[PDB]
């Protein structure tokens, strides 16, 4: 039966859209040159994409319950091409952000709609292995994206090439999907747009780029997001159409699956930002080097996603999410023990030894990887067919929102306790060095630098100790997932 070929064609679209997510990380500077922006106020090129990616997802997911899954993959691929062209044509930041928004909204649909395609063509008991492949295609593309950006600029010497190359690839993807997928009234537009508005307010309000973690425009957008979320809940009690129709949905396991997904997203983003900051601040790496620290964490995620799906066809979603999150917790407990000379250290197994940095990140990312497929499986288990699209979107939007809530909350606490640690360090370091090169002001500046580094390393520990604890809390919730 052609379902294997169909989900392969969908997975290649998911891969294609995932490259476009973080591709900008390697071409920001080349964009800054051509658009005329000084050494960032460039952030709309990521926050605008993420707005489209998150906010448009539930409604485009729901649209696939009505208009099917082939048509929306085609539409989003055409929109992914269109947005790419708009960005390639940009003399102006205002045109880049518009095109990135369209690319983001387009690319946001591909993963949920394809997860729902897998849910249509497979029964639950073997489905988790297929969700692992689709999820692997997402996590792998997200990680190869920056390299794809480098490579096409090495080919074509202009960053615009990224978004020109998107157009043929999108047309190729539409061709594969046209021949591969099964052939073939309203959705809740008002609720979808209300939810999109709420998600957007939260996404702008939470994202940030030194004694304050939210933008000053953040708090009112966040409080507005709660209000827009209430308005969404209130509307759909009086709506005839509902975005997720509650008939037959078992909400206790469904909502626990969303909350665990939220937790996993926080643990992901917490690691993505703190490890790179630990690279620059404690290890003294270039920004380009510090991002590359994330490699073994980033590579381990798709490996976990693929294998966790296969194991979950056999041992169950509850178990793989629980064990996978305990593997993630173990990884984060190890990362909490990092010293400032971690690159020089190894784990000693007596008769083999392993690099500390690389394997702690591998363990942490593999644990989070194991959880992607069985969480999606267990959310889809407790919803009817023709709610697969909106249900797949909910799991991803929960993960994406959990990323932003995670950094905001843990950075707030980390910053609070950093300052308390800084009080302790300044009180305890030798009040001056004896014969410092450059004189006493250089010794006092170095004392202040020494205090901030020592306090930052103490902050770093608690953050990943809490992140480990929250993974254990998620692992426990994993046992109240569906079965």
């Amino acid at each position, epitope marked *: 039966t052609s379902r294997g070929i169909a989900i392969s064609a969908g997975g290649l679209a998911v891969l294609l859209g995932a490259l476009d997510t973080y591709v900008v990380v390697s071409i920001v500077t080349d964009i800054m040159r051509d658009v005329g922006i000084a050494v960032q106020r460039v952030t709309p090129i990521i926050t605008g994409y993420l707005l489209g990616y998150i906010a448009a997802m539930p409604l485009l997911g729901r649209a696939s319950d009505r208009f099917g899954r082939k048509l929306l993959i085609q539409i989003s691929l055409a929109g992914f091409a269109l947005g790419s062209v708009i960005t390639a044509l940009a003399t102006n930041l205002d045109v880049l952000v518009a095109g990135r928004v369209i690319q983001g909204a387009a690319s946001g649909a591909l993963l949920p709609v394809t997860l729902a395609l897998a849910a249509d063509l497979w029964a639950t008991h073997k489905r988790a292995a297929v969700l692992g492949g689709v999820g692997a295609a997402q996590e792998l593309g997200a990680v190869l994206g920056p390299i794809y950006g480098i490579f096409v600029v090495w080919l074509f010497h202009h960053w615009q090439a990224v978004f020109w190359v998107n157009v043929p690839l999108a047309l190729i993807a539409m061709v594969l999907i046209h021949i591969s997928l099964p052939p073939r009234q309203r959705v809740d537009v008002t609720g979808g747009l209300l939810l999109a508005l709420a998600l957007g307010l939260a996404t702008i309000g939470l994202y940030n780029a030194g004694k304050q973690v939210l933008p000053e425009y953040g708090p009112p957008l966040i409080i507005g997001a709660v209000i827009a979320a209430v308005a969404f809940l209130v509307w759909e009690r009086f709506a005839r159409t509902r975005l997720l129709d509650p008939a037959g949905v078992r909400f206790r396991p469904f909502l626990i699956a969303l909350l665990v997904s939220l937790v996993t997203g926080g643990a992901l983003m917490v690691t993505l930002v703190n490890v790179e900051l630990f690279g620059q601040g*404690v*290890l*003294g790496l270039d920004q380009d080097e510090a991002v590359f620290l994330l490699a073994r964490f980033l590579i381990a995620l798709p490996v976990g996603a693929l294998l966790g799906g296969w194991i979950a066809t056999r041992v169950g979603d509850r178990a793989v999410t629980a064990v996978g999150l305990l593997i993630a917790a173990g990884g984060f407990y190890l990362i909490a023990q990092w*010293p*400032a*000379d971690v*690159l*020089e*250290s190894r784990h000693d197994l007596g008769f083999v030894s392993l690099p500390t940095l690389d394997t702690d990140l591998a363990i942490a990312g593999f644990g989070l990887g194991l959880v992607i497929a069985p969480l999606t499986s267990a959310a889809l288990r407790v919803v009817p067919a023709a709610q697969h699209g909106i249900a797949s979107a909910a799991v991803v939007v929960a993960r994406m929102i959990g990323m932003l809530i995670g950094i905001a909350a843990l950075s707030a606490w980390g910053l609070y306790r950093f300052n308390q640690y800084l009080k*302790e*360090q300044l*009180a*305890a*370091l*030798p009040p*001056a*060095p*004896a*014969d410092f090169p450059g004189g006493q002001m250089a010794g006092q500046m*170095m*004392r202040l*630098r*020494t*205090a901030t*580094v*020592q306090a930052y*390393v*103490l902050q770093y520990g608690e953050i990943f100790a809490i992140t480990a604890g929250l993974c254990v809390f998620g692992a426990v919730l994993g046992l109240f997932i569906a079965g």
Partner: nanobody
Amino acid sequence: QGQLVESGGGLVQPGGSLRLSCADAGSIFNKFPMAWYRQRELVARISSGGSTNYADFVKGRFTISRDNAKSTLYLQMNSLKPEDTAMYYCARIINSASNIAYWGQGTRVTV
């Protein structure tokens, strides 16, 4: 706390011995590389996990070690020579790649 407080210097007859101590706080005692320096001149270095490293003039005559019960770094110095006369400092190496360090008021050793 987060200290670096030397003690244990004194007068020594050639061939004699001393144990220098460096009080610290367990919060950070085990999270950075440490070293002892002469007056600057590196004597001994220890990674956060205990990997030792020494200069040429040491000839295996000293040992750098950690005691986690009182969070003290030590130099046991044996068979001391007139050339070892110096101020000794215990230093925390705040960046290991650049070997940027911080240290306190030392302790003087005279042989």
